[PDB]
Write a protein that binds this ligand. Sequence first.
Ligand SMILES: *[C@@H]1O[C@H](CO[C@@H]2O[C@@H](C)[C@@H](O)[C@@H](O)[C@@H]2O)[C@@H](O[C@@H]2O[C@H](CO)[C@@H](O[C@@H]3O[C@H](CO[C@H]4O[C@H](CO)[C@@H](O)[C@H](O)[C@@H]4O[C@@H]4O[C@H](CO)[C@@H](O)[C@H](O)[C@H]4NC(C)=O)[C@@H](O)[C@H](O[C@H]4O[C@H](CO)[C@@H](O)[C@H](O)[C@@H]4O[C@@H]4O[C@H](CO)[C@@H](O)[C@H](O)[C@H]4NC(C)=O)[C@@H]3O)[C@H](O)[C@H]2NC(C)=O)[C@H](O)[C@H]1NC(C)=O
Ligand SMILES: *[C@@H]1O[C@H](CO[C@@H]2O[C@@H](C)[C@@H](O)[C@@H](O)[C@@H]2O)[C@@H](O[C@@H]2O[C@H](CO)[C@@H](O[C@@H]3O[C@H](CO[C@H]4O[C@H](CO)[C@@H](O)[C@H](O)[C@@H]4O[C@@H]4O[C@H](CO)[C@@H](O)[C@H](O)[C@H]4NC(C)=O)[C@@H](O)[C@H](O[C@H]4O[C@H](CO)[C@@H](O)[C@H](O)[C@@H]4O[C@@H]4O[C@H](CO)[C@@H](O)[C@H](O)[C@H]4NC(C)=O)[C@@H]3O)[C@H](O)[C@H]2NC(C)=O)[C@H](O)[C@H]1NC(C)=O
Lengths: 208, 208
Amino acid sequence: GPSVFLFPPKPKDTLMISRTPEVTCVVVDVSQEDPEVQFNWYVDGVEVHNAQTKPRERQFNSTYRVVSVLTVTHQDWLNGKEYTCKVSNKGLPAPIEKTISKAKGQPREPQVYILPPPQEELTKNQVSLTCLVTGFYPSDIAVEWESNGQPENTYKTTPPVLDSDGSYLLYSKLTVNKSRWQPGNIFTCSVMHEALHNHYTQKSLSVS
Amino acid sequence: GPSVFLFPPKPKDTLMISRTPEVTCVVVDVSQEDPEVQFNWYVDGVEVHNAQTKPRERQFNSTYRVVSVLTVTHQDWLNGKEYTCKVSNKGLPAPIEKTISKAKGQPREPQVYILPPPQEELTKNQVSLTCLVTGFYPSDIAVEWESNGQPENTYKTTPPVLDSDGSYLLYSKLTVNKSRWQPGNIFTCSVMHEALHNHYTQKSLSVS
Ligand SMILES: *[C@@H]1O[C@H](CO[C@@H]2O[C@@H](C)[C@@H](O)[C@@H](O)[C@@H]2O)[C@@H](O[C@@H]2O[C@H](CO)[C@@H](O[C@@H]3O[C@H](CO[C@H]4O[C@H](CO)[C@@H](O)[C@H](O)[C@@H]4O[C@@H]4O[C@H](CO)[C@@H](O)[C@H](O)[C@H]4NC(C)=O)[C@@H](O)[C@H](O[C@H]4O[C@H](CO)[C@@H](O)[C@H](O)[C@@H]4O[C@@H]4O[C@H](CO)[C@@H](O)[C@H](O)[C@H]4NC(C)=O)[C@@H]3O)[C@H](O)[C@H]2NC(C)=O)[C@H](O)[C@H]1NC(C)=O
Ligand SMILES: *[C@@H]1O[C@H](CO[C@@H]2O[C@@H](C)[C@@H](O)[C@@H](O)[C@@H]2O)[C@@H](O[C@@H]2O[C@H](CO)[C@@H](O[C@@H]3O[C@H](CO[C@H]4O[C@H](CO)[C@@H](O)[C@H](O)[C@@H]4O[C@@H]4O[C@H](CO)[C@@H](O)[C@H](O)[C@H]4NC(C)=O)[C@@H](O)[C@H](O[C@H]4O[C@H](CO)[C@@H](O)[C@H](O)[C@@H]4O[C@@H]4O[C@H](CO)[C@@H](O)[C@H](O)[C@H]4NC(C)=O)[C@@H]3O)[C@H](O)[C@H]2NC(C)=O)[C@H](O)[C@H]1NC(C)=O
């Protein structure tokens, strides 16, 4: 029979208010004369009606896959609202309800540390500036790099890494050209998380 | 019908003689009264007869799961030898050949750097020393931390991270009580990977 998969908004949508944090409910495995199924949504047990439900998409494996996206506020999601996608079929003994919400647990503020290169690497053609971030719970978080004010193109971030106390940690690397490093340019890692002042913090450094 | 999953030896075991590196062939979904099945092993198209096989392990979900552990040398694996576990069944008609071998690609030497704490952190009651390993390939790699010879209990390590050029990178944090950091001690990272001198390299640092 068919199967439901409810998904959470992005750790970056949930924090900033320019983007829209959304909650996506998905159905799969709806056979070929199973008529339309119907999203009933509920937030903490009351029916909202603003979910932009989409059409009935065909799949390579000849199934029907259905989606309903539902916009939510950041206030709401981070207050621990319990969002629910109920689905009735036309050809299924039951209706299927799934529910989702923010992670439970006393949120913990990280602290950011920029780290410089190593005195070994400074002679190299490029160098690796390091943003260590640690102590953060919940695991959902976001990092960016900017330079003089202008944002940075290329960098790489590890997935969060569970720590021995139950907090999470991660590292982020930034390759910068040996050329561009020296002339006292100034570089800054910036981090977004539930438990920050303005949900936002930066460290920064120079060639000192 | 039944399915066959072949699995390689882990990087640590592939890198030193002390340990024994193994190639594991696992069949799952051998049904209720379908009798035994055989492993026919081959190495680059020649049959070896040394796999320490175990007998049929029945599962919760009511199938028969079978395993054969074949042992290899390290020179064998790093020469890129192709190992195959073929399965005769007494049920579904076919043989099921499955093949495994080392990752293809010109190996790259991991360049490793210890990084000290950040000035910021020092007033905390613990500190975080950082081993950064970059530019390595294949992704199979092992990191350990020791101090005055003795190894370390707490050390976390990110899973490798694909880089913009195709090499991999990773980080490792070591938390040490500040009571251990600042009375004159020496600390050391240790890295293992095929494209190295003696498949092993280490950096080290101290309160200078
Ligand atoms: C027919 O095809 C469809 C379409 O898929 C396509 O089919 C064929 C043609 C191939 O080409 C496929 O390669 C192709 O993808 C099949 O639909 C699939 O159905 C399976 C189930 O049979 C679903 O499995 C689930 O997967 C989700 C993860 O799905 C996300 O991530 C995938 C990649 O990571 C991505 O492909 C998906 O589209 C989806 O992607 C994310 O989507 C969100 C929302 O849009 C988006 O914001 C993200 O950015 C995006 N991410 C990425 C990386 O793209 C997974 O969550 C499920 O795991 C849980 O459930 C398992 C039980 O099935 C269980 O074993 C797990 O341990 C895990 O347990 C859960 O844990 C959660 C969280 O930790 C927790 O709440 C619970 O404890 C627990 N919950 C549950 C319910 O168990 C699950 O594995 C596929 O998502 C789905 N694919 C697509 C594309 O929709 C269909 O099955 C096929 N039918 C047949 C008969 O074969
Ligand atoms: C009945 O149950 C059994 C037992 O499982 C258990 O059953 C129930 C009771 C629950 O408790 C389960 O939670 C529990 O697991 C079922 O047996 C399972 O069968 C499925 C297949 O149906 C297997 O799926 C495959 O999984 C492997 C990974 O398996 C490793 O990792 C698991 C955890 O991550 C671990 O549980 C396994 O034991 C095994 O563990 C590893 O083992 C090695 C060797 O011993 C060891 O060195 C490792 O340290 C160890 N690791 C860990 C973390 O423990 C996965 O590789 C497969 O994925 C490939 O294939 C998929 C398609 O099947 C495909 O979607 C993927 O993309 C992927 O692609 C392959 O890989 C590469 C890279 O992508 C690609 O280049 C290849 O070309 C491609 N090849 C193929 C062929 O696809 C796959 O997902 C389970 O492992 C297996 N579980 C166990 C424990 O054996 C049984 O199926 C059940 N039967 C029924 C009817 O329900």
